[PDB]
Amino acid sequence: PKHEFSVDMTCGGCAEAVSRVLNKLGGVKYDIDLPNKKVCIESEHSMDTLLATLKKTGKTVSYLGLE
Amino acid sequence: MPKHEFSVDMTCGGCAEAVSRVLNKLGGVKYDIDLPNKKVCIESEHSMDTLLATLKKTGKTVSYLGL
Ligand SMILES: OC[C@H]1O[C@@](CO)(O[C@H]2O[C@H](CO)[C@@H](O)[C@H](O)[C@H]2O)[C@@H](O)[C@@H]1O
Numbered sequence: 001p002k003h004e005f006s007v008d009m010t011c012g013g014c015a016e017a018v019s020r021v022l023n024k025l026g027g028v029k030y031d032i033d034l035p036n037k038k039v040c041i042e043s044e045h046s047m048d049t050l051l052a053t054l055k056k057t058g059k060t061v062s063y064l065g066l067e
Numbered sequence: 068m069p070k071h072e073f074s075v076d077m078t079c080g081g082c083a084e085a086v087s088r089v090l091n092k093l094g095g096v097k098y099d100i101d102l103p104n105k106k107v108c109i110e111s112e113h114s115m116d117t118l119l120a121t122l123k124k125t126g127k128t129v130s131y132l133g134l
């Protein structure tokens with residue numbers, strides 16, 4: 001499944017930060033849309049693991065669903 | 068009591084808010100964030116190690132500017 005999250009990013013540095021923590025987690029295929037403040041992820045990790053990883057950044061995060 | 072200074076690569080207000088949230092979550096800290104100068108000052112008993120690790124959770128590039 002491809003999980004979609006709303007992540008409050010407001011500059012390229014914000015997106016870069018999200019990319020860095022997801023890479024640290026590893027085993028992820030993702031794309032970040034800055035203007036629409038959305039991050040889509042595909043991985044063997046649980047939704048909870050992904051959510052916690054994103055929330056640890058200090059940014060506002062919410063789960064939108066999956067495709 | 069110790070007063071630490073860190074360099075944090077923040078590039079927008081949202082970046083600063085995220086740093087604030089991770090420090091608020093850690094607790095036991097008195098901090099000041101200087102966005103334009105990419106500097107975060109922290110007065111805390113928490114070890115330099117703990118503070119560095121906490122700031123790194125933001126996914127931003129962090130370095131130590133000393134006591
Ligand atoms: O610290 C490595 C970590 O940084 C990220 C954050 O987006 O990527 C940036 O740094 C890379 C250098 O290794 C650049 O190639 C890349 O373009 C840049 O965004 C993570 O992707 C990477 O794991």
Ligand SMILES: [Cu+]
Binds near residue numbers: 009014
């Ligand atoms: Cu930002």
